[PDB]
Amino acid sequence: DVQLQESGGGSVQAGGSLRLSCVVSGLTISNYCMRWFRQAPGKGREGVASINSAGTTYYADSVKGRFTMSRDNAKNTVYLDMNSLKPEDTAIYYCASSTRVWGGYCGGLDDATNNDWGQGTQVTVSS
Numbered sequence: 001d002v003q004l005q006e007s008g009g010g011s012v013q014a015g016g017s018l019r020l021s022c023v024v025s026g027l028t029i030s031n032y033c034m035r036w037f038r039q040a041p042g043k044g045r046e047g048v049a050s051i052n053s054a055g056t057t058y059y060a061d062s063v064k065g066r067f068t069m070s071r072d073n074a075k076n077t078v079y080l081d082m083n084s085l086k087p088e089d090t091a092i093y094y095c096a097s098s099t100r101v102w103g104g105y106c107g108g109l110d111d112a113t114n115n116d117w118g119q120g121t122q123v124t125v126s127s
Contacts, residue, residue, distance in 0.1 A: 002026040002116040004095050009121030012085055020080040020121060022095030029071060030055075033098040033106040034078045035115065036069060038091035038123075045112060048093070049080060053104020060109050062088070085125045092120040 003025040012018050020036075036048040049069040051057045057069050068081045078095055096115040098107060107114065 002097065002099055004097065004116065004118030006093065006095050006118045006121035009093065009123045011124040011126065013126050014086055016085055016125075017081065017083045018085065018123060019082070020093055020095075020123075022078045022080075022118060024076050024078065024095075024097065027076075027097055027099065028073075029076050029078055029097065030073055031104055033101065033104065034069075034071070035096040035098065035106075036078075036080050036093060037096060037112065038089075038093045039120075040088070040091040043091075045094070047109035047111065050106045050109060051078070052106045058106060058109060082123075085123075087125050087127050090123060090125045092122055094118055094120045 005023045008020040035050040038048050039045040049059045051069050066084045070079050095118045098114045099116045100114040
């Protein structure tokens with residue numbers, strides 16, 4: 001039974017940084033593509049970052065450089081470090097594992113199929 005629990009969302013001002021956490025239960029996160037998605041207000045859910053079993057990371061065009069994803073295997077937890085946040089980063093950030101893919105590789109960033117999903121965490125970035 002795969003459970004993902006996000007935390008660390010909050011209000012921050014543009015320029016600032018935040019760190020999100022996603023604690024995973026029922027899977028070893030090293031063996032899967034783990035992912036961050038987000039849904040901005042009124043918008044469809046979008047891919048943000050992902051990390052394959054080799055710990056290689058891929059990032060969406062709009063966040064590359066600024067955002068970084070990593071992994072802590074002893075805690076079975078996945079992080080997103082968001083640096084130089086902008087008003088457009090305001091969204092519910094959701095963590096996911098590509099549970100139903102055989103392989104440790106990642107689908108495309110915007111590939112919301114094959115996943116178990118957490119519940120989301122709110123990030124608000126004021127001007």
